[PDB]
């Protein structure tokens, strides 16, 4: 089984009327839920407006994220993968001088919709510096990318991190 932390979705912005049961009935549409909790005050039992769900597999997390926007009990909520900042841009290092835009696009477009690819060049000489930035239309692409142990693009093992 994949590590549980990689199977969780933190759901912010809940309606205070959402319950463990209604959150579960909603998110079970995209996979088997091994856990589903609405966070509540320990004294009043009033909802804290957020909670979490745990799927059986990472593929199911992907399916839930691909089904956004989620309207749960009448309110659009904000699911995010667990920490294991929320940004839309990555740094890609170690691509050397022969990696081109299409190598980066063909690979990273499978994580999400790309808005910008910036291959970095030397301000003085114009030579490629061996790193790039990729901006996506949404943060979940970045979140999937940075939890991978490895990234291989154009035969190179790359270092990938969130950018600003």
Ligand X SMILES: CN(C)C(=O)CNc1ccccc1
Q: Name which position in 59, 101, 106, 137 contacts ligand X (CB under 6 A).
A: 59
Tell me which residue has tokens 């142990």: 149
Closer residue to ligand X (CB): 148 or 157: 148
Strands (DSSP E) along 13-94, which ranges? 33-40, 47-55, 71-72, 75-76, 78-81, 89-93
CB 136 within 8 A of CB 88: yes
Please, which of residues 60-79 interact with ligand X by CB under 6 A? Answer: 62
Report the nearest approach of ligand X to the CB of residue 78 (Å): 21
By CB under 6 A, how many residues form the interface with ligand X? 3
Residue with the CB atom nearest ligand X in the bound state: 58
**Is residue 126 helix, strand or coil?**
coil
Q: Is 6 an interacting residue with respect to ligand X (CB under 6 A)? A: no
Report the nearest approach of ligand X to the CB of residue 47 (Å): 31
Closest among 10, 3, 164, 2 to 83, alpha carbons compared: 10
Tokens of 71: 């309207």
Closer residue to ligand X (CB): 52 or 55: 55
Report the nearest approach of ligand X to the CB of residue 96 (Å): 28
Report the nearest approach of ligand X to the CB of residue 108 (Å): 15
Q: Is 109 an interacting residue with respect to ligand X (CB under 6 A)? A: no
Q: Is the peptide bond prior to 4 cis by the omega test (within 30 degrees of 0)?
A: no
53/28 Cα distance (integer angstroms): 9
Closer residue to ligand X (CB): 26 or 81: 81
Q: Is 58 an interacting residue with respect to ligand X (CB under 6 A)? A: yes
Question: Using CB under 6 A, which of the segments 42-50, 57-65, 90-98, 100-108 binds ligand X?
Answer: 57-65
* 3-state percent breakdown (helix, strand, coil) of the chain, nearest 5: 25, 35, 40
The residues binding ligand X (CB under 6 A) are: 58-59, 62
């Amino acid at each position: 089984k994949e590590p549980e932390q990689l199977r969780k979705l933190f759901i912010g912005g809940l309606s205070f009327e959402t319950t463990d049961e209604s959150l579960r009935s909603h998110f079970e549409q995209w996979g088997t839920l091994t856990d589903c909790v609405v966070m509540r005050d320990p004294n009043t039992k009033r909802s804290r407006g957020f909670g979490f769900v745990t799927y059986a597999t990472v593929e199911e997390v992907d399916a839930a994220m691909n089904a956004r926007p989620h309207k749960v009990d009448g309110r659009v909520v904000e699911p995010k993968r667990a920490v294991s900042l929320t940004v839309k841009k990555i740094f890609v290092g170690g691509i050397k001088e022969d990696t081109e835009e299409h190598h980066l696009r063909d690979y990273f477009e499978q994580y999400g919709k790309i808005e910008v690819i910036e291959i970095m060049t030397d301000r003085g000489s114009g030579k490629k510096r061996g790193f790039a930035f990729v901006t996506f239309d949404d943060h979940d692409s970045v979140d999937k990318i940075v939890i991978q142990k490895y990234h291989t693009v154009n035969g190179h093992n790359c270092e990938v991190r969130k950018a600003l």
